[PDB]
Amino acid sequence: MSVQDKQGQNINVGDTVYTPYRGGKHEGQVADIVTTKEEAAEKGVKNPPKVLFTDQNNKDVAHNPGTLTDLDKQ
Amino acid sequence: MSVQDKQGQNINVGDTVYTPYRGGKHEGQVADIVTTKEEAAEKGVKNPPKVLFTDQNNKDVAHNPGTLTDLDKQ
């Protein structure tokens, strides 16, 4: 089933997601949603679920869904 | 302090690093060594030190240096 953001909204591939940190943000479009330990291992990430997206500085980020915001579902 | 692999070898940018998982591996050349909180946040990773590399399937991996092997330094 679906993975949800910090506002309970289903996250889809291609959606713009956002997470802030002290000094900046990571914002960009979802490329993949990883939900099993095996898929996480294959994609080189840890602790699913992970939302994989490229941010505004062209950095590939893997982030937990429950602490980001899907801007397209706001 | 330098950044070292699981065999205590200093890792350099460009070195092939390797980590196995059940069903595959992640192997590729180090592109960046992240040691500061500032750079970790900019690159969307946690808990420096991290070594950043693209694996043989074009997955961008961020990994603890001390839990992988620097193949070029064997």
Residue numbers in the entry:
A (entry chain A), B (entry chain B): 4 to 77
What's the paper's own text on this?
We have identified a novel gene that is associated with changes in virulence, CNAG_02591 (hypervirulence-associated protein 1, HVA1), through gene expression microarray analysis that compared two mouse-passaged strains to the pre-passage H99W strain. The HVA1 gene is predicted to contain 3 exons separated by two introns that encode a 75 amino acid protein. No known protein domains or homologous gene families exist for this gene. Metabolomics analysis suggests that when HVA1 is absent there is a block in the citric acid cycle, while structural analysis of the Hva1 protein suggests a potential interaction with NADPH.
To gain insight into the potential function of HVA1, the structure of the Hva1 protein was solved by X-ray crystallography and refined to highly acceptable accuracy. The three dimensional architecture of each Hva1 monomer was predominantly β-stranded. There were seven β-strands of varying lengths with five forming interdigitating antiparallel hydrogen bonds to create a semi-cylindrical barrel-like twisted β-sheet. In addition, this small protein also contained one unconnected α-helix. Overall, the monomeric structure of Hva1 resembled a 6-fingered human palm with the α-helix forming the thumb. The crystal structure further revealed that the protein crystallized in a P1 space group with two Hva1 monomers that are related by a non-crystallographic two-fold symmetry. The interface is very extensive as the “thumb” helix of the first monomer is inserted firmly into the “fingers” forming the semi-cylindrical barrel of the second monomer. The monomers are connected by extensive polar and apolar interactions. Although the observed 2-fold association between the two Hva1 monomers may be a crystallographic artifact, the potential for these interacting surfaces to attract ligands and binding partners cannot be completely ruled out. The region corresponding to the monomer-monomer interface of Hva1 was occupied by a bound nicotinamide adenine dinucleotide phosphate (NADP) ligand in DHFR-NADP complex.
